[PDB]
């Protein structure tokens, strides 16, 4: 139910390619995205499990 | 690398990749035992691959060597990206040959306008995603400190400089981080960050390696 | 359960006075703090039930 | 305000406060109907208060006026804080008297070395919290752009200047934002940001009002 779960995935400005999970509310589940390795927003997880625990349902 | 070209298979022996589950960063081989990367590329376990051109298609030249020490700059700021540089000591020294070889550290700062070579297996699209299997290269000049500042007001510290094109269309991208910016045979830059990739008036920002020559010597000596 | 819930609260550089919520790991619940109006870290929520619903027992 | 003093009751008539259930920011009255504050002090609904000295204990003469239009600068950057300035239009014109009065706009940029008066109801502790009821004041010099940029490498934009003391001890603080910095009968500045409050080599940073002199004209024109 938290609003940060509805934000777009945030790669950020760094140039790494790090697989992270975000909740996609229009899908109703967690998806993979590329994180750059700095300045993570809150819709950004190490597992889908981590992701659902926090954002699932949203 | 956006708007670049496939590297000659023969020509960048100093180019390494850092791997965990997958390829996540690049690096530069700077002595038989040590690699320079970005501090934002830090992970607790890394295996360095050496001698790659195509990261999916092995030509037989490749070496797979674990990092035994992974040492971020002690003044790296996770939010401003200040001092974004890191050293890795390999567990065994690399076997030196035509495909695995070192690059010179800088002996001076690079003059604005100098032509540099940036390289990496980073995204080749500014939007969405094409992560290439083949190593890509970009010819790019060092920009002035004033151009760099004008592009990124509030964000450019003393450890940072810009290399690229204010018109956009050519730049480094995700998965390029930690990799080399080479200017006349010397490693002048480490791929760090930017606003998007290849956006107008938003060139790549790179760490000024010349600023860490002492630290790298000290660290390498502290860690024999 | 997220490990950013373990960070102390972060007022930041700006000079507003804005009440926000952070998870105090040692107390086991959410508390108030003064937020300056910019550069929020992740342990920064707009209310208690908000905070406790994402960091509650972190 | 840290390391300052209680203002005289009948001496800062241009000083205002911004309120949303509580005092959150200051502001400056520049005409009978307009207030200058900081962009980071934006809220959708704002109640301005005028003629206050003690924000708890009313001496009879305070005005409580809802803001009608609240207008952040369009090039305001919430990350770098470039262009940290905002204009508020009062729903009624302020009654101008001994205790509510406008501050003149500036006729030239901030000049280093000049003594300014910074004021507000900000925290008076560098550490912990004492939000004061009585309006506080600090006399402090404009610092040189060089001193400003060395204290904060890369972070100072065209829209910013530092006022205060590199020794620390004396500075503006939380709840002070948006409030006035007056040098020689003109509003030179708007309280913006800083690293901590009253830390050594970390002076307050303020928005240059002078930069927005045409925007303030044009904004009032367009809306009045």
Curated annotation (Swiss-Prot), chains A, C:
Gene Ontology CC terms, in alphabetical order: extracellular space; serine protease inhibitor complex
Site entry: Reactive bond for trypsin: 15-16
GO biological process: negative regulation of platelet aggregation; negative regulation of serine-type endopeptidase activity; negative regulation of thrombin-activated receptor signaling pathway; trypsinogen activation
MF annotations from Gene Ontology: calcium ion binding; molecular function inhibitor activity; potassium channel inhibitor activity; protease binding; serine-type endopeptidase inhibitor activity; sulfate binding; zymogen binding
Residues annotated as domain BPTI/Kunitz inhibitor: 5-55
Keyword terms of this UniProt record: Disulfide bond, Pharmaceutical, Protease inhibitor, Secreted, Serine protease inhibitor, Signal
Cysteine disulfide partners in this protein: 5-55, 14-38, 30-51
Highest taxon, organism lineage: Eukaryota
Localisation per UniProt entry: Secreted
Main location: secreted
Main function: Inhibits trypsin, kallikrein, chymotrypsin, and plasmin.
Protein name: Pancreatic trypsin inhibitor
Organism (species): Bos taurus
Residue numbers of the full-length protein present here: 36 to 93 of 100
Curated annotation (Swiss-Prot), chains B, D:
Keyword terms: Calcium, Digestion, Disulfide bond, Hydrolase, Metal-binding, Protease, Secreted, Serine protease, Signal, Sulfation, Zymogen
The keyword Signal appears for this protein: yes
Activity control summary: Not inhibited by Kunitz-type trypsin inhibitors.
Site (Required for specificity): 171
UniProt cofactor note: Binds 1 Ca(2+) ion per subunit.
Cofactor: Ca(2+)
Gene Ontology terms: biological process: antimicrobial humoral response; digestion; endothelial cell migration; proteolysis; zymogen activation
EC assignment: 3.4.21.4
Molecular function GO labels: calcium ion binding; serine-type endopeptidase activity; serine-type peptidase activity
Catalyzed chemical reaction(s): Preferential cleavage: Arg-|-Xaa, Lys-|-Xaa
Residues recorded with modification Sulfotyrosine: 131
Peptidase S1 domain location: 1-221
Annotated binding of Ca(2+), by residue: 52, 54, 57, 59, 62
UniProt subcellular location: Secreted
Protein name (database record): Trypsin-3
Organism: Homo sapiens (Human)
Gene from which this protein is expressed: PRSS3
């Amino acid at each position: 139910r938290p609003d940060f779960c509805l934000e777009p995935p945030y790669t950020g400005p760094c140039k790494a390619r790090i697989i992270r999970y975000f909740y996609n509310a229009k899908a109703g589940l967690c998806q993979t995205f590329v994180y750059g390795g700095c300045r993570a927003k809150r819709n950004n997880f190490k597992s889908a499990e981590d992701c659902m625990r926090t954002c699932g349902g949203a | 690398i956006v708007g670049g070209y496939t590297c000659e298979e023969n020509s960048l022996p100093y180019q390494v990749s850092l791997n965990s589950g997958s390829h996540f960063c690049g690096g530069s081989l700077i002595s038989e035992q040590w690699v320079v990367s970005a501090a934002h590329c830090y992970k607790t376990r890394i295996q360095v691959r050496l001698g790659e051109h195509n990261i999916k298609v092995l030509e037989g030249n490749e070496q797979f060597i674990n990092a035994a020490k992974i040492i971020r700059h002690p003044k790296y700021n996770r939010d401003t990206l200040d001092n974004d540089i890191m050293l890795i000591k390999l567990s065994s020294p690399a076997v030196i040959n035509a495909r695995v070889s070192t690059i010179s550290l800088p002996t001076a700062p690079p003059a604005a306008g100098t032509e540099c070579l940036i390289s990496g297996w980073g995204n080749t699209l500014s939007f969405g995603a094409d992560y290439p299997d083949e190593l890509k290269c970009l010819d790019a000049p060092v920009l002035t400190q004033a151009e760099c500042k004008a592009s990124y007001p509030g964000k450019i510290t003393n450890s940072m400089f810009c290399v690229g094109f204010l018109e956009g269309g050519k730049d480094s991208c995700q998965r390029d981080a930690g990799g080399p910016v080479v200017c006349n045979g010397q490693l002048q830059g480490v791929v760090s960050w930017g606003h998007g990739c290849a956006w107008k008036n938003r060139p790549g920002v790179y760490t000024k390696v010349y600023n860490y020559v002492d630290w790298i010597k000290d660290t390498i000596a502290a860690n024999s």
